[PDB]
Design an enzyme around this catalytic site. Structure first.
Site, PDB file in Angstrom:
ATOM      1  CB  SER A   1       0.471 -35.872  40.109  1.00  0.00           C
ATOM      2  OG  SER A   1       0.159 -34.990  39.368  1.00  0.00           O
TER       3      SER A   1
ATOM      4  CE  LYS B   1       2.317 -32.160  42.020  1.00  0.00           C
ATOM      5  NZ  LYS B   1       1.653 -32.621  40.863  1.00  0.00           N
TER       6      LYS B   1
ATOM      7  CB  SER C   1      -2.000 -33.159  43.057  1.00  0.00           C
ATOM      8  OG  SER C   1      -1.126 -33.821  42.229  1.00  0.00           O
TER       9      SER C   1
ATOM     10  CD1 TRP D   1      -6.030 -38.342  34.323  1.00  0.00           C
ATOM     11  CD2 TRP D   1      -7.351 -37.710  36.118  1.00  0.00           C
ATOM     12  NE1 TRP D   1      -7.263 -38.177  33.989  1.00  0.00           N
ATOM     13  CE2 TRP D   1      -8.229 -37.746  35.004  1.00  0.00           C
ATOM     14  CE3 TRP D   1      -8.015 -37.376  37.431  1.00  0.00           C
ATOM     15  CZ2 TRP D   1      -9.640 -37.771  35.095  1.00  0.00           C
ATOM     16  CZ3 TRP D   1      -9.320 -37.283  37.420  1.00  0.00           C
ATOM     17  CH2 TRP D   1     -10.171 -37.170  36.197  1.00  0.00           C
TER      18      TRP D   1
ATOM     19  NE  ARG E   1      -7.296 -40.916  40.407  1.00  0.00           N
ATOM     20  CZ  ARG E   1      -6.538 -39.678  40.602  1.00  0.00           C
ATOM     21  NH1 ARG E   1      -5.642 -39.579  39.860  1.00  0.00           N
ATOM     22  NH2 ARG E   1      -7.112 -38.655  41.315  1.00  0.00           N
TER      23      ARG E   1
HETATM   24  C1  9CP Z   1      -0.816 -35.295  38.395  1.00  0.00           C
HETATM   25  O1  9CP Z   1      -0.831 -36.179  37.854  1.00  0.00           O
HETATM   26  N1  9CP Z   1      -1.763 -34.023  38.021  1.00  0.00           N
HETATM   27  C2  9CP Z   1      -1.837 -33.130  38.780  1.00  0.00           C
HETATM   28  C3  9CP Z   1      -3.314 -32.660  39.063  1.00  0.00           C
HETATM   29  N2  9CP Z   1      -3.268 -33.599  40.404  1.00  0.00           N
HETATM   30  O2  9CP Z   1      -3.854 -34.857  39.864  1.00  0.00           O
HETATM   31  S1  9CP Z   1      -3.854 -35.917  40.894  1.00  0.00           S
HETATM   32  O3  9CP Z   1      -4.687 -35.672  42.009  1.00  0.00           O
HETATM   33  O4  9CP Z   1      -4.353 -37.299  40.147  1.00  0.00           O
HETATM   34  O5  9CP Z   1      -2.285 -36.106  41.018  1.00  0.00           O
HETATM   35  C4  9CP Z   1      -3.957 -32.854  38.112  1.00  0.00           C
HETATM   36  C5  9CP Z   1      -5.444 -32.192  38.202  1.00  0.00           C
HETATM   37  C6  9CP Z   1      -3.672 -33.451  37.071  1.00  0.00           C
HETATM   38  C7  9CP Z   1      -2.204 -34.002  36.552  1.00  0.00           C
HETATM   39  C8  9CP Z   1      -1.597 -33.373  35.537  1.00  0.00           C
HETATM   40  N3  9CP Z   1      -1.226 -34.324  34.556  1.00  0.00           N
HETATM   41  O6  9CP Z   1      -1.520 -32.370  35.635  1.00  0.00           O
HETATM   42  C1  9CM Z   2     -10.804 -31.949  42.864  1.00  0.00           C
HETATM   43  C2  9CM Z   2      -9.307 -31.475  43.132  1.00  0.00           C
HETATM   44  C3  9CM Z   2      -8.157 -32.072  43.475  1.00  0.00           C
HETATM   45  C4  9CM Z   2      -6.836 -31.636  43.558  1.00  0.00           C
HETATM   46  C5  9CM Z   2      -5.945 -32.529  42.838  1.00  0.00           C
HETATM   47  N1  9CM Z   2      -5.746 -33.862  43.437  1.00  0.00           N
HETATM   48  O1  9CM Z   2      -5.425 -32.059  41.720  1.00  0.00           O
HETATM   49  N2  9CM Z   2      -7.189 -30.282  42.912  1.00  0.00           N
HETATM   50  C6  9CM Z   2      -7.846 -30.025  41.706  1.00  0.00           C
HETATM   51  C7  9CM Z   2      -9.349 -30.214  42.292  1.00  0.00           C
HETATM   52  N3  9CM Z   2      -8.889 -29.254  43.380  1.00  0.00           N
HETATM   53  O2  9CM Z   2      -9.860 -28.232  43.726  1.00  0.00           O
HETATM   54  S1  9CM Z   2     -10.377 -26.845  43.222  1.00  0.00           S
HETATM   55  O3  9CM Z   2      -9.512 -25.953  43.283  1.00  0.00           O
HETATM   56  O4  9CM Z   2     -11.639 -26.985  44.103  1.00  0.00           O
HETATM   57  O5  9CM Z   2     -10.930 -27.591  42.045  1.00  0.00           O
HETATM   58  C8  9CM Z   2      -7.428 -29.326  43.704  1.00  0.00           C
HETATM   59  O6  9CM Z   2      -7.017 -28.353  44.539  1.00  0.00           O
END
Ligand code: 9CP
Ligand code: 9CM
Length: 244
Positions: A50, A53, A97, A190, A230
């Site tokens: 991510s 992005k 994200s 991630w 993180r």
């Molecule tokens: C980014 O690496 N992503 C998208 C999404 N947000 O994660 S982050 O907040 O660490 O960027 C996620 C839940 C997982 C990940 C992916 N590999 O899709």
């Molecule tokens: C913890 C979260 C963080 C975020 C991300 N950084 O990927 N994302 C996934 C999950 N989340 O909210 S959820 O819909 O309530 O799971 C969402 O918007």
């Protein structure tokens, strides 16, 4: 008065206590400082996940594939996370994200233009292969933590080969925290589609005086680990060094 030995021990302890292996690279002017409990990670390649992005948004905005107020509609199909099941701008999709919005943006750019732009900015290994919608998630695109902190440094200082307006638009999407008079701009990552799973937090601290201190945290994400570790390690490392 705090010794280099003490700062290094303290930052290493943050990664040790999280039961992971990682590095945090900080840049002050042209000097790169490497901290953490697995220093050899600094020049190793990992999928950007991510963190891509940031560059995806710069490419899309520069090449008129989207505007900052454009609402990307949710298609109505089930998503991994309920907060992604909604209509959102690029900025909202950056904070959440939300992968589907950035996959739509990548598809609008298309493989030919995406590869030319990724090569033009010279991001990581610069290879995107043949799949325009997942190259930053499962490979072949890879980048090192040193390359990520240098990318963050370039963006913070508007040095990337994009219009100043394009860089300013993407930077506005990245504000994640305000501590005293310091502003933290960053994007987490991630790599869930790779083994081992990589965790990132790349950005910069904008101090009250205007000084910009880029950083890139890189670690291994383990089973049942919270994404917030993180952010927690990063903030504790920046606070330990007196950056925030
Ligand atoms: C980014 O690496 N992503 C998208 C999404 N947000 O994660 S982050 O907040 O660490 O960027 C996620 C839940 C997982 C990940 C992916 N590999 O899709
Ligand atoms: C913890 C979260 C963080 C975020 C991300 N950084 O990927 N994302 C996934 C999950 N989340 O909210 S959820 O819909 O309530 O799971 C969402 O918007």
């Amino acid at each position: 008065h705090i010794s280099s030995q003490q700062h290094e021990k303290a930052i290493k302890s943050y990664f040790d206590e999280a039961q992971t292996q990682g590095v945090i690279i900080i840049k002050e002017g042209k000097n790169l400082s490497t901290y953490g409990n697995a220093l050899a990670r600094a020049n190793k390649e990992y999928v950007p996940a991510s963190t891509f992005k940031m560059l995806n948004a710069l490419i899309g905005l520069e090449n008129h594939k989207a505007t900052t107020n454009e609402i990307f509609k949710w298609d109505g199909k089930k998503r991994t996370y309920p907060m992604w099941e909604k209509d959102m701008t690029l900025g909202e999709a950056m904070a959440l994200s939300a992968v589907p919005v950035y996959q739509e943006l990548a598809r609008r750019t298309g493989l030919e233009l995406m590869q030319k732009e990724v090569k033009r900015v010279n991001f990581g290994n610069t290879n995107i292969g043949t799949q325009v919608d997942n190259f930053w998630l499962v490979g072949p695109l890879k980048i090192t933590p040193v390359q990520e902190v240098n990318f963050a440094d370039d963006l913070a200082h508007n040095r990337l080969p994009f219009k100043l307006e394009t860089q300013e638009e993407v930077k506005k999407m990245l504000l994640i925290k305000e501590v005293n008079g310091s502003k933290i701009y960053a994007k987490s990552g991630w790599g869930m589609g790779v083994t081992p799973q990589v965790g990132w937090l790349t950005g910069w601290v904008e101090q009250a005086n205007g000084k910009k201190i880029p950083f890139s945290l890189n670690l291994e994400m383990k089973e049942g680990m919270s994404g917030s570790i993180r952010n927690e390690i990063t903030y504790k490392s920046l606070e330990n060094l007196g950056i925030i």
